[PDB]
Amino acid sequence: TTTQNVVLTKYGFDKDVTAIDRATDQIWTGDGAKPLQGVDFTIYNVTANYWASPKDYKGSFDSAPVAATGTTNDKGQLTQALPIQSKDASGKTRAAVYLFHETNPRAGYNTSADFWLTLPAKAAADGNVYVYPKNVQKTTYERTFVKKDAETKEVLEGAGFKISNSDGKFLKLTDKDGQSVSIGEGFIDVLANNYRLTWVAESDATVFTSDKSGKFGLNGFADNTTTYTAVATNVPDGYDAAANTDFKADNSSSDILDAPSGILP
């Protein structure tokens, strides 16, 4: 019959800050750390795996049934009621053991290590068992471009670009689950939207487009050492296609110029 509520809360910290551990009976607000939404966990029931030989259990969830799955909400939380008792491989009732496995980290963050515990666990005053897995922020990189009229030097809205890598593959943004998303004008905040960068054929690539300040680009690049190329695909009427622009994700902004098309007598 009986279950305990396990409340998992996922907080992000500055890269050089390492949270102190919290007991399961303590409610911790995160002290200003940012809650991480959209992070997927699978909870495995490893009762049988552990009780086959407790002193040898090193975290295997091979063949373990899935007790639950979830995704952190806006508060960084997922809550799951778990049976405090479960059966081992021979059918005998035992204290249940559950292993928490992060299957999909937030963009810009490392995954957290697998952890496990026995129930019932020490609970807070409200009866819930609180866990706070650590996800360390990894440094990522961004790039901004400003489209301008080569003659007037004024910013130019509505210019379309695709991005290519050294293999001739082009950038496609997806959501956390790998599905298509609708990208508009401007700088795309990959980190804030929890998007992914993928590399595909030119025809399926994402088009980035200069906004009303001429701006386009994105964050969430893995490194600042690889060369990519911005290639004009949509040219505003009355301009000549900008030349390809080689770049690195180096957190800079730089201008891409469009020459007004010349009309001769």
Author numbering: 38 to 302
The authors write:
As the first reported host of “non-pathogenic-derived” pili, Lactobacillus rhamnosus GG is a gut-adapted commensal lactic acid bacterium (LAB) and one of many clinically investigated probiotic strains for human use in the prevention and treatment of certain gastric ailments. As with other Gram-positive bacteria, sortase-dependent piliation in L. rhamnosus GG (called SpaCBA) is assembled from the ~30 kDa SpaA (backbone), ~20 kDa SpaB (basal), and ~90 kDa SpaC (tip-located) pilins. Two immunoglobulin (Ig)-like subdomains comprise GG-SpaA, each having the conserved residues of a canonical E-box motif and internal isopeptide bonds formed between either lysine and asparagine or lysine and aspartate residues. Our findings show that the GG-SpaA structure has certain features in common with other pathogen-derived pilin-proteins, such as the Ig-like CnaB-type folds and the presence of internal isopeptide bonds6940.
